[PDB]
Structure 1
Amino acid sequence: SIEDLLARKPKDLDDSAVAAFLKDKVVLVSGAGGTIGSELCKQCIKFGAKHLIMVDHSEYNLYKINDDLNLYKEKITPILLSILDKQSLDEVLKTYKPELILHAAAYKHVPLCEQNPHSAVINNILGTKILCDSAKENKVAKFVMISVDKAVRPTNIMGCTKRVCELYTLSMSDENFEVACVRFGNVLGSSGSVIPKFKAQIANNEPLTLTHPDIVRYFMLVAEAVQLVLQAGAIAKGGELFVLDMGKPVKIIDLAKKMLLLSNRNDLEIKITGLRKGEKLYEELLIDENDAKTQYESIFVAKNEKVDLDWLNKEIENLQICEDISEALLKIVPEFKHN
């Protein structure tokens, strides 16, 4: 498959380290039924968690991960809930008392977040704030947030919201509440992504729609990225911003041409449709020459400074009442260059 070709095959996967980290923990995964969340759930079971609390607001996604894990039904609890509902979330944390939260709930589609910037702010930034605050209040030991390469020097609403989430969570970290954020690039074949789009175009005898002939993305298999996130979480002492080594990036045109070749449909045209609002031709390379190494060659630690939460809480209030979200985000993330 195209997925096989573009896998990272990291040499530094470490099952026993992840097992030592997760063994007999109560773990709560937000966005449990999503592309990333579902793989986190599966690896929590694989690596010995005692009790998995699966939180998702999408009933089909929750249904599906719970069904996928039916052999482990006695050790999993499906919680149908938005992380925006602080009272209910608080009751869940009090009831089950997780020691680890893995936070993979967010809105991610760049065009939809450009079209719905208030909902992006609410779901991503406020959702993160509510979940992180409830975690810290309820004495959750460790909190790992999934982040993304689009958070680095962002040019779109989505990526900027994730950068605010990084600032918030990392600035919450202290001696009793250890926070890590892990940035990585595209996961092969995630929900609503380019590979399934191109497969559907081919199955329907449609030209492939390519945004720009030069566009590239970095890719990893979901199982690779997730296990590396868990390795990073295991070694985290709190306050770390981790970045994953994605390998070489992939030109999307080469992806398109390879899928046409694999399907034997080279009679199909590749049609160029144009770069979309806020879209980058090349996402930022994650690992900086001054980032710190870890014991895993695939995981580095990027610099981050805490911000004053009295400031950031005020600005988060502002984002909820302001007439121009793009301008309000720029006040928090001065490197935001909204395309």
Structure 2
Amino acid sequence: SIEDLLARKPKDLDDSAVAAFLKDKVVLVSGAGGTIGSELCKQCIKFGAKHLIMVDHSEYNLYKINDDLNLYKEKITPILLSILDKQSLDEVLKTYKPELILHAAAYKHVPLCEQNPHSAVINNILGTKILCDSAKENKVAKFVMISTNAAVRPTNIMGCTKRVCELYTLSMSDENFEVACVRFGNVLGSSGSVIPKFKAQIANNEPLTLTHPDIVRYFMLVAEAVQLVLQAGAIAKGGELFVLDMGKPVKIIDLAKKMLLLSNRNDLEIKITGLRKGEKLYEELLIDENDAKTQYESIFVAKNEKVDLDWLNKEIENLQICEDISEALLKIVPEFKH
């Protein structure tokens, strides 16, 4: 398998630490039925959580993860809900009183967020604000925000919104409501990503569409990223912006060729179709030489400064009505180059 070949296989997976962190917890996962959310769900059950509240706005995604976990049906509750519905979300948190929220709900596609920036802002930033505020109000002990390497020096709407969500959640962190964010890169075979695209092109005898001959990405398996996110949540004391190490980058052309080789399909061409708007060619330096080490060699802590929430709330209000979203996002993230 191509997944197998590019797997990170990190040597510092710690089952026992995740078990101790999750034992008998009521846990709520937003985006429960997504690529990452579904794997969080599965690992929460595997590592002994008492009760899993699965929140997703996509009815098929929710149905599917509920169905996948049907052997544990007594321990899970499928909540069909947008996190933008504050009043319903508050009712959910007061009812179940989760001690941990794993926030994986977001819009993540670079091109679609470029084309729909307002919805990106609303779903990502406002949805994060609503979920985060509700968690703090409802005395959730720990809140882990799934973030992305795309939030570093963002060149696109999606990335920028995720950076704003880091700023917001980390600024809400305190002794009673401990927030951690976890940045990582491309999850192998995730929803709507390049591996399923190539797989489908091959199966339909189409040429593979490669954006640029020199483009590279960092990859890991969903089970690896999720477990490390959970180990990061487990060691968090509140306020940490974590980042995962992912090994060496992989050329997408090499990925394309390996896929072709694995299906004995060297009858097919690889066609250059050009960079998509917002897209980086090399991403960013993963780990700064001065990020703090943790006890896990795959997990580092990056520097982050709280921001004045009053100011941030004003900017977020403006984001929901303003005419130029890109320019507005810049006033919040001055490193944003769109």
TM-score by length of 1: 0.99
* 1:133 and 2:133 matched: yes
> SS at the partner of 1:181?
strand
Q: Give the Å deviation of 1:283.
A: 1.0
For 2:140 and 2:115, locate their aligned partners in 1 and report how far apart those are by CA, in whole Å.
35
Distance in 2 between the 1:6 and 1:154 partners? 25
Give secondary structure in 2 for the equivalent of 1:212: coil
Matches of 1:28 and 1:72 in 2, distance apart?
15
Rounded to whole Å, the distance in 2 between the matches of 1:74 and 1:188 is 31
Structure 2 distance, partners of 1:316, 1:286, is 28
User: Once superposed, what is the RMSD of the aligned Cα atoms?
Assistant: 0.4
Gaps of 5+ in 1: none
SS class of match (2:287): coil
Task: Tell me which residue corresponds to 1:32.
Answer: 32
CA apart distance, 1:284: 1.0
Aligned counterparts of 1:330 and 1:84: Cα–Cα separation in 2: 24
Deviation sequence 1:187-211 (CA, Å, 0-9, x none): 0000001000000000101000000
CA drift of 1:285 comes to 2.5
The answer to whether the Cα contact below 8 Å between 1:23 and 1:50 also exists between their aligned partners in 2 is: yes
The question of whether the paired residues in 2 share the 8 Å contact of 1:114 and 1:158 is answered with yes
Work out the number of aligned pairs and report it. 338
Q: Is the 8 A contact 1:183 1:286 kept in 2?
A: no
Q: Could you tell me how far apart the structure 2 residues matched to 1:189 and 1:277 are?
A: 22
How far apart are 1:146 and its partner, in Å? 0.3
Per the alignment, residue 279 of structure 1 pairs with 279
Is contact 1:32–1:62 with CA below 8 Å preserved after alignment?
yes
1:248 counterpart residue number: 248
Work out whether residues 293 and 299 of structure 1, in 8 Å CA contact, stay in contact via their aligned partners in 2. Answer: yes
1:91-120 superposed Cα distances (whole Å, 9 cap, x missing partner) = 000000000000000000110000000000
Deviation at 1:276, TM superposition (A): 1.1
Q: Distance in 2 between matches of 1:110 and 1:220?
A: 19
Mapping of residues 37-56 of structure 1, within 5 Å: 37-56=37-56
In 2, distance between residues paired with 1:118 and 1:86?
A: 19
Deviation of 1:267 after TM superposition, in Å, equals 1.3
**Aligned-partner Cα distance in 1 for 2:228–2:168:** 22
Contact 1:101–1:143 under 8 Å retained in 2: yes
Q: Helix, strand or coil for the counterpart of 2:101? A: strand
* Identity in percent: 99
Q: CA deviation at 1:265?
A: 1.0
Q: What stretches of structure 1 move > 3 A for 4+ residues in a row?
A: none
Partner Cα distance (1:202, 1:144) in 2: 38
Distance in 1, matches of 2:182 and 2:285, equals 14
The 2-side partners of 1:195 and 1:258 are apart by 11
Listed one character per residue, the Cα deviations across residues 240-276 of structure 1 (whole Å, up to 9, x for unaligned) are 0000000011000000000011111111010000001
- Hey, what's the Cα distance between the residues in 2 that align with 1:156 and 1:255? 24
TM-score under structure 2 length normalisation: 1.00
Do the aligned partners of 1:184 and 1:225 also contact (CA within 8 Å) in 2?
yes
Per the TM alignment, residue 307 of structure 1 is displaced from its structure 2 partner at its CA by: 0.1
How far apart, CA to CA, are the structure 1 residues paired with 2:106 and 2:2? 26
- Deviation readout 1:255-310 (Å, 9 max, x if unpaired): 00000111111110100000011100011122110000000000000000000000
